[PDB]
Design an enzyme around this catalytic site. Structure first.
Site, PDB file in Angstrom:
ATOM      1  CB  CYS A 255      -1.099  -0.002   1.152  1.00  0.00           C
ATOM      2  SG  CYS A 255      -2.379  -1.100   1.174  1.00  0.00           S
TER       3      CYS A 255
ATOM      4  CG  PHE B 288      -8.151  -5.353   0.545  1.00  0.00           C
ATOM      5  CD1 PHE B 288      -7.809  -4.097   1.443  1.00  0.00           C
ATOM      6  CD2 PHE B 288      -7.596  -6.502   0.652  1.00  0.00           C
ATOM      7  CE1 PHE B 288      -7.033  -4.594   2.387  1.00  0.00           C
ATOM      8  CE2 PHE B 288      -6.929  -6.860   1.909  1.00  0.00           C
ATOM      9  CZ  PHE B 288      -6.671  -5.939   2.654  1.00  0.00           C
TER      10      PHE B 288
ATOM     11  CG  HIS C 155      -2.675   4.199   1.406  1.00  0.00           C
ATOM     12  ND1 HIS C 155      -3.372   3.683   0.243  1.00  0.00           N
ATOM     13  CD2 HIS C 155      -2.857   3.174   2.163  1.00  0.00           C
ATOM     14  CE1 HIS C 155      -3.878   2.758   0.191  1.00  0.00           C
ATOM     15  NE2 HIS C 155      -3.549   1.991   1.396  1.00  0.00           N
TER      16      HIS C 155
ATOM     17  CG  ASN D  19      -6.867  -0.025   1.058  1.00  0.00           C
ATOM     18  OD1 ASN D  19      -6.213   0.692   0.139  1.00  0.00           O
ATOM     19  ND2 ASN D  19      -6.352  -0.674   1.813  1.00  0.00           N
TER      20      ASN D  19
END
Ligand SMILES: CNc1ccccc1C(=O)SCCNC(=O)CCNC(=O)[C@H](O)C(C)(C)COP(=O)(O)OP(=O)(O)OC[C@H]1O[C@@H](n2cnc3c(N)ncnc32)[C@H](O)[C@@H]1OP(=O)(O)O
Ligand SMILES: CNc1ccccc1C(=O)SCCNC(=O)CCNC(=O)[C@H](O)C(C)(C)COP(=O)(O)OP(=O)(O)OC[C@H]1O[C@@H](n2cnc3c(N)ncnc32)[C@H](O)[C@@H]1OP(=O)(O)O
Lengths: 376, 376
Positions: free
Chosen positions: A150, A201, A289, A322
């Protein structure tokens, strides 16, 4: 002349997944609707995820055909590899196509290619697959960033800055492409933190052109990559771990990973911005992020950010989920775009200096100092 | 001031494997001694491999404990991952330890770390494992090159050249670490080209320190990385392929991959050396990945190299085998060392300009122009 970002573009699979409908569908298709306590646990995770929808090439049809990707630990690496290794460069090409189209130059001026994914490795890799698909020069210098998770959205600008600044006239195509094909599994009550994974995700591909010394007459700078740093957090071993196994990519998390990032994040801000003489974290623009809301929430708290330093970041979080290395890149498209439309002074929400953060295994913090460019 | 190689060092597992004894032991331990035609096929491969011995952390004891790594397609990824992910950074640390020791500076002056392996991926990767093991600054900027195969020995100098030249005062630790844990399997007569793999692949770790602008009083240059290029060979799709699967790393080869490299290699030599004004391929020194003898043999032929341009390359081939990304690095230790002991004018076998080749999937040729430094 610094590494300058000249163009950005994004792509996602067609299948939209509404987070409001996901806890039922997930426990339906994983045949688990009798873990009613766990189903409600996951319902709370999904509601507090602050993710409205996610895109997933993995559909109900593909999941019905591969029952073992619906078990928690189903022997399923091959089936996932078979999907994912096609899908990674494919969805990367959609994004790359558009980014070149926006840059306004022939693809033969792309001297370097950085490809990045955590959705599955192969030999040759998605760097080759994408070079053959776009039809780039066979002499393009490729860097294949596999399985860096990530923070790798900032890795790829840290990589590109050096590539492009030490190679006069160069132009780097960056492609991040990510999906949940290797990480999707059914739930397990010995493995709650994998439910965290299932709530967040998403799939998504992002592509950039990066080059130093832009030609004023035919390309339009968006950002300047000033510096890029990378550090490991003290006492953070084991907090995020992911193994590629016969069951696919298993992901094992710790509860206080939001605490490691918030506690330490100022260290990186001080290291990056103090030599510049910048000390007010609200005076800069912010890409971070969105690994989980708990990360972004706590950094907002520990540092005192106004309620909207993280708007673009949380916006892409809710609209896409994500998407691992791509998120930070999507966020820069959103904020670059939105500023123009709302006519702010600079692509940096009107501000001059910016920060861009990647978070992932290690634990690792990637810190990229940006500069905005003016608008109109 | 160019990216200069300041120090090199190598490490291998203890278990020596004599190629003369390997065709019996291999077909013994894979319980295949009744494929007598295939056993003799493999005996011919091993004899013509021009490999005297190989090092392998994978021993008979480990193989007896994991029968499925002795089948051709035994479900065995986890067992291999369990061995290999420890062994990769471990054997990389042995080499790194010694390379720092030779460089003569504290490990805290290492600003960057490039780690490279094809023996298995993980999250975090062997970059983290090795940084924790050596005790490098937590701020070391890491690049994790996964699964780039046999050309990646030159990739890591192409990477390091840009890293170190665009970052004044920097010092890069490169570590390549490779083993046969994920690729070892039993033989199959529908899959002869995997026998090719079993005759060649070895374990080996190599480590370098690379930095531009060396300090004359405390570090000793060995080579200058002048340029580094990367190209794909026309019509070469599919020639080398490797998939990470439930059975481990499956490797599928084509017979005429030695023909693709020889036919095309001059293209890269012309591209690299003609702007320098160098046209006599015997007037330069030579490092070439010994992927197979057929590669090196045919390049020697197609180009007309004297019988000993490739001595160091073939020497490391016979003494160690195909250690993937490490070989090209081992060869530079051998030739750097041997020149000194035989007192030649320069580390480049007395010559001034050098070439360094990596070969692998794509098909891909990595071309690195070196410069030697004088001796004594
Ligand atoms: C390898 N990686 C990748 C690879 C590819 C692509 C992407 C990645 C990655 O993405 S890298 C990963 C980086 N992001 C994160 O780590 C997320 C940080 N967390 C948050 O963002 C929020 O916290 C949530 C999760 C939305 C919850 O929302 P919220 O309700 O506000 O949190 P709470 O703690 O209050 O309660 C929530 C309920 O779930 C339980 N529980 C929540 N967390 C965890 C956890 N770790 N481990 C074990 N259990 C957990 C918790 O016990 C509680 O149950 P109870 O025990 O209370 O019943
Ligand atoms: C993913 N990669 C990696 C990952 C990690 C680490 C490392 C790697 C790599 O390493 S990347 C790989 C780069 N290197 C190479 O590709 C090797 C190039 N070849 C040579 O170096 C020589 O040729 C040999 C093999 C020593 C034979 O020696 P030699 O005897 O001189 O050759 P011959 O062709 O005359 O006969 C030899 C007998 O074996 C048969 N046969 C030989 N070849 C192949 C082949 N492709 N495919 C199918 N069959 C083959 C052949 O039919 C004949 O049987 P017959 O049909 O004749 O009975």
């Amino acid at each position: 002349g610094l590494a300058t970002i000249l163009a950005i573009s994004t792509a996602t699979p067609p299948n939209c997944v509404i987070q409001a409908d996901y806890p039922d569908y997930y426990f339906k298709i994983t045949n688990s609707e009798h873990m009613t306590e766990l189903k409600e646990k996951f319902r709370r995770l999904c509601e507090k995820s602050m993710i409205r929808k996610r895109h997933m090439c993995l559909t109900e049809e593909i999941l019905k055909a591969n029952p073992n990707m619906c078990l928690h630990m189903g022997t399923s690496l091959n089936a996932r590899q078979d999907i994912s290794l096609v899908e990674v460069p494919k969805l990367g090409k959609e994004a790359a196509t558009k980014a070149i189209k926006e840059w306004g130059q022939p693809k033969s001026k792309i001297t370097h290619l950085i490809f990045c994914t955590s959705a599955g490795v192969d030999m040759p890799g998605a760097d080759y697959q994408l070079t053959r698909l776009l039809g780039l020069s066979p002499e393009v210098k490729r860097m294949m960033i596999y399985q860096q998770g990530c923070y790798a959205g900032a890795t790829v600008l840290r990589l590109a800055k050096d590539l492009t600044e030490n190679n006069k006239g160069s132009r780097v195509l960056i492609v991040c492409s990510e999906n949940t094909v290797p990480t999707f599994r059914g739930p397990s009550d010995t493995h709650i933190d994998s439910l965290v994974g299932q709530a967040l995700f998403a799939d998504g591909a992002a592509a950039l052109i990066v080059g130093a010394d832009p030609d004023a007459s035919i390309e339009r700078p968006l950002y300047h990559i000033v510096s890029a740093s990378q550090t490991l957090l003290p006492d953070s071993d084991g907090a995020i771990e992911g193994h590629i196994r016969e069951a696919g990519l298993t992901v094992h998390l710790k509860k206080d990973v939001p605490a490691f990032f918030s506690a330490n994040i100022e260290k990186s801000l001080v290291d990056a911005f103090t030599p510049i003489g910048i000390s007010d974290w609200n005076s800069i623009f912010w890409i971070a992020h969105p690994g989980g809301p708990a990360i972004l929430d706590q950094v907002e708290e520990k540092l005192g950010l106004r309620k909207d330093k993280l708007k673009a970041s949380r916006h892409v979080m809710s609209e896409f989920g994500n998407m691992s290395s791509a998120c930070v890149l999507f966020i820069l498209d959103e904020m670059r775009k939105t500023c123009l439309e709302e006519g702010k002074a600079t692509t940096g929400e009107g501000l001059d200096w910016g920060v861009l953060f990647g978070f992932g295994p290690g634990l690792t913090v990637e810190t990229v100092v940006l500069r905005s460019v003016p608008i109109e």
